[PDB]
Amino acid sequence: ARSVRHIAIPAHRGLITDRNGEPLAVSTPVTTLWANPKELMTAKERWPQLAAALGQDTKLFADRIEQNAEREFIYLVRGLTPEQGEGVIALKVPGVYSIEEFRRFYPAGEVVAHAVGFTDVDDRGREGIELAFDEWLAGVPGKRQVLKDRRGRVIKDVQVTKNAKPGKTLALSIDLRLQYLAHRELRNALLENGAKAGSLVIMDVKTGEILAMTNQPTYNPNNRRNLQPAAMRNRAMIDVFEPGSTVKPFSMSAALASGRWKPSDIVDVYPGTLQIGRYTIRDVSRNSRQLDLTGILIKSSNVGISKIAFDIGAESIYSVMQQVGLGQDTGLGFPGERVGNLPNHRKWPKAETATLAYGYGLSVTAIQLAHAYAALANDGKSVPLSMTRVDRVPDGVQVISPEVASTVQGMLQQVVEAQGGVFRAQVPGYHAAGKSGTARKVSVGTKGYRENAYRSLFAGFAPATDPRIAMVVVIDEPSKAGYFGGLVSAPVFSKVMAGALRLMNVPPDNLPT
């Protein structure tokens, strides 16, 4: 009984590129060699030559065919270069048949593994963009008819029943040049500092495009041999943290929007504590007795921010935070992505009101944090995020008055450049602005906080005169060269922002440096 078999024609999976066409995920053609044992049994004399061409051992190769002498089909070796396979087929060994397949290849490897993700052995998206746009990127295989004889030898390819159709191309918002830069600097910082993990997000403040998104640890998607679950996490999007002092500029925005505060107002912060109930608000830098509003950010006074918070009420703070998108849904639909949490209480005690205002009792993703800073930097206009390239600048929503936004921009520029500021965040050639942050990590195995485990943050944008990009840098558990946001994350911000701005041809607004 001889028969017509149907065989599959593999389809081309769609090309994933960066915003300028750099390929990030590509289906590369490869050759899979298969054999008809029956046909091979009639050429035993050719085996050793064949086994040596496939690099296999002669006897082990022979046992294989002998074990499967009954079958009319077995794989010899899968995934060869189109050159090698045709080299072996040129040997004319009976019973040896090739077929063109595809291998998904990631040219930038670990640089973009988190954002891009990967496919499985049957080319289904399993992680990341591969997963998220699987329908878009997948193609439909073809089918064709082959005529086989009694003993499984292929006589004729009779017809193609249906053609293969390739997937569609996807252009991301990422700029791979910025991504290369960001990845390397974040990795350096992680190693210098003895940190466990980190994230780094860069955003176009005008368009909402995610220009770069890297995390540590990472992995090579082209070789997942000894892959650990930890390394696979796109932490920027799926890991949440308490933003700490990095939310003060929004507290401060609420204050200026309340009508009850103005930049020149001075707040008494002595003695760097403020007892309320059984809980004690503390400042780290206990030097100045009184600060103006700009000095509350520069020195990052929790006490100072608390007092403003007691004046204006929680709802005015909760509401600015909500409007800049903290604890809100981004709309990206990245797999695993978290919304985070902006607590809503019926009545707001003093404690929760103060901790909210200086960044605890709420949890954000690095992506949200950057989104919020982008709104601030875009003169109070929030624009929706995109992880795909944006055709035309979208309509944004005015979430902070331009005048408040402008004022807070000036303040944050001070935080960086003023004496006693976060000088390590300065970008050569440009004026930049931003906020340091340093948060104790939450205890494992109990409520409350860890006595020696810190998360280091820096969040800012540049250029100060006309902002173009917002950036966030988050490093977990540094243990080698201090832990303050402004010692650990700010220098990373400095370098990447420098490169970023250069690589996008933004003209320097601070010729003096």
Ligand SMILES: *C(=O)[C@@H](NC(=O)[C@H](NC(=O)N1CCN(CC)C(=O)C1=O)c1ccccc1)[C@@H]1N[C@@H](C(=O)O)C(C)(C)S1
């Ligand atoms: C901003 O981040 C601010 N950081 C701290 O005050 C920080 N405080 C905390 O981590 N916590 C944990 C949660 N709770 C309970 C609700 C707190 O009361 C609280 O304050 C802190 C504390 C000790 C050592 C380092 C950090 C200020 N800004 C940072 C910064 O890096 O810019 C400073 C270190 C200057 S303090």
